[PDB]
Scaffold this active site. Structure first.
Site, PDB file in Angstrom:
ATOM      1  N   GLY B  24      19.825  21.661 -17.918  1.00  0.00           N
ATOM      2  CA  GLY B  24      18.806  21.880 -17.773  1.00  0.00           C
ATOM      3  C   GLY B  24      17.709  23.677 -18.117  1.00  0.00           C
ATOM      4  O   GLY B  24      17.423  23.882 -17.410  1.00  0.00           O
ATOM      5  N   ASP B  53      17.279  11.326 -27.424  1.00  0.00           N
ATOM      6  CA  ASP B  53      17.556  10.934 -25.525  1.00  0.00           C
ATOM      7  C   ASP B  53      16.369   9.541 -25.472  1.00  0.00           C
ATOM      8  O   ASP B  53      15.231   9.200 -25.526  1.00  0.00           O
ATOM      9  CB  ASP B  53      16.854  11.743 -25.072  1.00  0.00           C
ATOM     10  CG  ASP B  53      16.987  12.160 -23.649  1.00  0.00           C
ATOM     11  OD1 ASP B  53      17.124  11.479 -23.157  1.00  0.00           O
ATOM     12  OD2 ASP B  53      16.936  13.726 -23.598  1.00  0.00           O
ATOM     13  N   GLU B 221      23.249  32.574 -16.948  1.00  0.00           N
ATOM     14  CA  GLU B 221      24.495  32.562 -16.212  1.00  0.00           C
ATOM     15  C   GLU B 221      25.642  32.528 -16.537  1.00  0.00           C
ATOM     16  O   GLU B 221      25.489  31.758 -17.469  1.00  0.00           O
ATOM     17  CB  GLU B 221      23.641  31.313 -15.336  1.00  0.00           C
ATOM     18  CG  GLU B 221      22.469  31.627 -14.322  1.00  0.00           C
ATOM     19  CD  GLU B 221      21.882  30.368 -13.759  1.00  0.00           C
ATOM     20  OE1 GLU B 221      20.476  30.354 -13.544  1.00  0.00           O
ATOM     21  OE2 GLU B 221      22.586  29.235 -14.275  1.00  0.00           O
ATOM     22  N   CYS B 261       8.880  39.886  -3.770  1.00  0.00           N
ATOM     23  CA  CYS B 261      10.047  39.281  -3.499  1.00  0.00           C
ATOM     24  C   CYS B 261      11.526  39.092  -4.158  1.00  0.00           C
ATOM     25  O   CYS B 261      11.838  39.909  -5.141  1.00  0.00           O
ATOM     26  CB  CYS B 261       9.576  37.674  -4.052  1.00  0.00           C
ATOM     27  SG  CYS B 261      10.412  35.924  -3.686  1.00  0.00           S
ATOM     28  N   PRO B 291      10.813  34.068 -21.724  1.00  0.00           N
ATOM     29  CA  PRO B 291      10.257  34.302 -20.238  1.00  0.00           C
ATOM     30  C   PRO B 291      10.278  33.092 -19.560  1.00  0.00           C
ATOM     31  O   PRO B 291       9.864  31.904 -19.897  1.00  0.00           O
ATOM     32  CB  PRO B 291       9.118  35.010 -20.202  1.00  0.00           C
ATOM     33  CG  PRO B 291       8.238  34.423 -21.508  1.00  0.00           C
ATOM     34  CD  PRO B 291       9.746  34.193 -22.335  1.00  0.00           C
ATOM     35  N   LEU B 292      10.671  32.678 -17.788  1.00  0.00           N
ATOM     36  CA  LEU B 292      10.113  31.566 -17.105  1.00  0.00           C
ATOM     37  C   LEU B 292       9.089  31.344 -17.000  1.00  0.00           C
ATOM     38  O   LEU B 292       8.173  33.120 -17.397  1.00  0.00           O
ATOM     39  CB  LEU B 292      11.454  32.208 -15.868  1.00  0.00           C
ATOM     40  CG  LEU B 292      10.853  31.399 -14.812  1.00  0.00           C
ATOM     41  CD1 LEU B 292      11.107  29.668 -15.182  1.00  0.00           C
ATOM     42  CD2 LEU B 292      11.232  31.778 -13.744  1.00  0.00           C
ATOM     43  N   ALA B 294       6.310  29.023 -14.349  1.00  0.00           N
ATOM     44  CA  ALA B 294       6.271  28.173 -13.634  1.00  0.00           C
ATOM     45  C   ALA B 294       5.664  26.746 -13.705  1.00  0.00           C
ATOM     46  O   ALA B 294       4.853  26.880 -14.172  1.00  0.00           O
ATOM     47  CB  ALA B 294       5.366  29.181 -12.092  1.00  0.00           C
ATOM     48  N   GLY B 295       6.234  26.290 -13.767  1.00  0.00           N
ATOM     49  CA  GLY B 295       6.464  24.696 -14.678  1.00  0.00           C
ATOM     50  C   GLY B 295       6.900  24.421 -15.310  1.00  0.00           C
ATOM     51  O   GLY B 295       7.925  24.542 -15.659  1.00  0.00           O
ATOM     52  N   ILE B 297       5.791  23.591 -19.187  1.00  0.00           N
ATOM     53  CA  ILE B 297       4.868  23.727 -20.440  1.00  0.00           C
ATOM     54  C   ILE B 297       4.983  22.085 -20.636  1.00  0.00           C
ATOM     55  O   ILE B 297       5.957  22.043 -21.646  1.00  0.00           O
ATOM     56  CB  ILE B 297       5.806  24.331 -21.700  1.00  0.00           C
ATOM     57  CG1 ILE B 297       6.173  26.046 -20.916  1.00  0.00           C
ATOM     58  CG2 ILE B 297       5.070  24.871 -22.024  1.00  0.00           C
ATOM     59  CD1 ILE B 297       6.969  27.165 -21.199  1.00  0.00           C
TER      60      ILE B 297
HETATM   61 MG   LIG Z   1      16.439  20.771 -20.827  1.00  0.00          MG
HETATM   62 ZN   LIG Z   2      10.855  34.567  -5.728  1.00  0.00          ZN
END
Ligand SMILES: [Mg+2]
Ligand SMILES: [Zn+2]
Ligand SMILES: [Cl-]
Ligand SMILES: [Cl-]
Ligand SMILES: [Mg+2]
Ligand code: NA
Ligand code: NA
Ligand code: NA
Lengths: 323, 326
Positions: B24, B53, B221, B261, B291-292, B294-295, B297
């Site tokens: 993921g 897939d 990670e 945060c 970049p991350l 939010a959500g 794309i």
């Molecule tokens: Mg994926």
């Molecule tokens: Zn946060």
């Protein structure tokens, strides 16, 4: 099956507790936490927490110098820590032959390493320790450290294949290939005997257990599922999973931050997978804290949630105050 | 070596581009983004983005219904998508091969994979010979692409393979070696030889670093790093060119916001740690830092705006507002 480690923490039968989990998963905090909880809960028994991590993770976690000599953690008269390097005349032939085997035969390297940790324990005990009732093994982040448990089977199956082939034709061919053969049979069979003895206690679910440590993320679930399968093949008891770094984002007063909210939606998705996959496991759900948790004080306040489940509704204050 | 895929995006040499990453990790978004960037930068060429897939990830990513027959993505002149299921197609073809064997069954035999499946013999060797399952499955996908290239000028110049979320898809690349050994021992051997030759033909192109490359996709990670190392080593063992890593879901938290945060700040601190590890371990690689958002794309609009940071490095100071726009 309660979502906590209370029955383990108060168990008077367990003498060997393994704690493990790969990938920056809160493993050493969990090792320290289990050790503290057991020591606080059973003040009449003596506990040892031992690491083989060259990074000296226990020294980092408690904020004091630990080494090969067992020392009580300051503030406890019940818990001691050790940090040892297990990697650290015919014996040169005996060692060189045995070194050649570590690279090619699985379990030998692990057996020699763990036999060395056991030697360090009994040395600390005889020289006024004086005897630990239960040992908490903070397992190394790298390697399959319990692989020695399959060794007695591995090398006996190899001896039968050796016994089948050698008995073909000889002793012309037998002496030719076995010329300058360092025997090492006595050193190998005693290693097999030492493991078989250890196996008697380690495959007994009342004496020995392995607590797995993970986070609620795809690759950590994958790594945890394979860890458990590895331990089942060793006949090692596993019924405890600690899930760390949980946000419980829907709860915190001072809500908001969608980044955190989306991260906990994903964590919740894998929590449902864990709950369904590990129905008869103690799955203990532990809160994320701001920074890493260090010092006896913060370790004991956090550790309490291994015994009685963290409730984000009520216990939030404790967490946002370790921060 | 630049922290972008610019040279790949503007390459007029590459025919086969593989995109992969497990956990993921933004893999589907990366496949789509690579496809879009190439098609926008090379309007004179025709591009195919293909997925294998069963969950229909490309349909979900674009918000369009894709399938077995190639369709242009709406709003694009030179990008088409396909979604097929080669394992399910092979099982169907094999069941029929077995049914024709049991009965008195003729074959069209006019090539190619249908001939390989004769009697179902090759399919029940998939358990004893690694790489066969993967070879036949990839032969299914090549078959579907060639069929989709109709007859006319409907042949694609470049195919972007959005690799399946599970399995070791390219394991077939090791087949010519494992079969050369196996058959050194050793109808069925005739089929093994046809298969070996088929994979060797693929290898001529798939091991050519000018024609074929693999883009790895990960997250910053520990476990994703080691899974990527594992993938890289797998591709090296296939003689697959790999010199690109896309690192997704990066917070760049010290920028954009400010100090708000601390949990995101702590997370960004951990991301920087493994980003540093990646940078050193893979110094000769294009390490592209994304970049991350939010959500999700989803949709051509959001995907083309995001995808630009594969060509020219995202700058958290400059480009933060673009991520807010999504
Ligand atoms: Mg994926
Ligand atoms: Zn946060
Ligand atoms: Cl240990
Ligand atoms: Cl282990
Ligand atoms: Mg750790
Ligand atoms: Na026919
Ligand atoms: Na594909
Ligand atoms: Na692969």
């Amino acid at each position: 099956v309660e979502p906590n480690l209370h029955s383990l923490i108060t168990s008077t039968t367990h003498k060997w507790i393994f704690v493990g989990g790969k990938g920056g998963v809160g493993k050493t905090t969990s090792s320290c936490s289990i050790a503290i909880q057991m020591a606080l809960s059973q003040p009449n028994k003596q506990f040892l927490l031992i690491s083989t991590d060259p990074a000296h993770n226990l020294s980092d976690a408690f904020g004091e110098k630990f080494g090969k000599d067992a020392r009580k953690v300051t503030g406890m008269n019940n818990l001691s820590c050790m940090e040892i390097d297990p990697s650290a005349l015919g014996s040169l032939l005996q060692g060189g032959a045995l070194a050649d085997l570590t690279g090619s035969i699985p379990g030998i390297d692990e057996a020699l390493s763990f036999m060395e940790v056991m030697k360090h324990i009994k040395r600390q005990e005889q020289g006024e320790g004086e005897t630990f009732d239960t040992v908490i093994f903070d397992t190394a982040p790298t390697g399959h450290t319990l692989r020695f448990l399959q060794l007695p089977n591995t090398l006996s199956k190899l001896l039968e294949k050796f016994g089948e082939i050698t008995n073909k034709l000889g002793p012309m061919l037998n002496s030719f290939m076995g010329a300058g053969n360092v025997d090492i049979s006595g050193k190998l069979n005693e290693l097999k005997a030492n493991v078989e003895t250890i196996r008697q206690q380690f495959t007994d679910p009342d004496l020995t257990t392995f607590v797995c440590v993970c986070i609620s993320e795809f690759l950590s679930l994958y790594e945890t599922e394979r860890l458990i399968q590895e331990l089942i093949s060793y006949d090692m008891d596993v019924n405890s999973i600690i899930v760390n770094q949980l946000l419980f984002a829907e709860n915190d007063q001072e809500h908001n931050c969608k980044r955190c909210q989306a991260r906990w939606k994903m964590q919740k998705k894998y929590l449902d997978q864990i709950d369904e996959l590990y129905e008869d496991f103690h799955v203990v759900k532990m809160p994320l804290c701001a920074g890493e948790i260090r010092g006896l004080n913060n370790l004991t306040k956090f550790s309490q949630f291994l015994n009685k489940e963290y409730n984000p509704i009520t216990d939030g204050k404790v967490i946002y105050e370790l921060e």
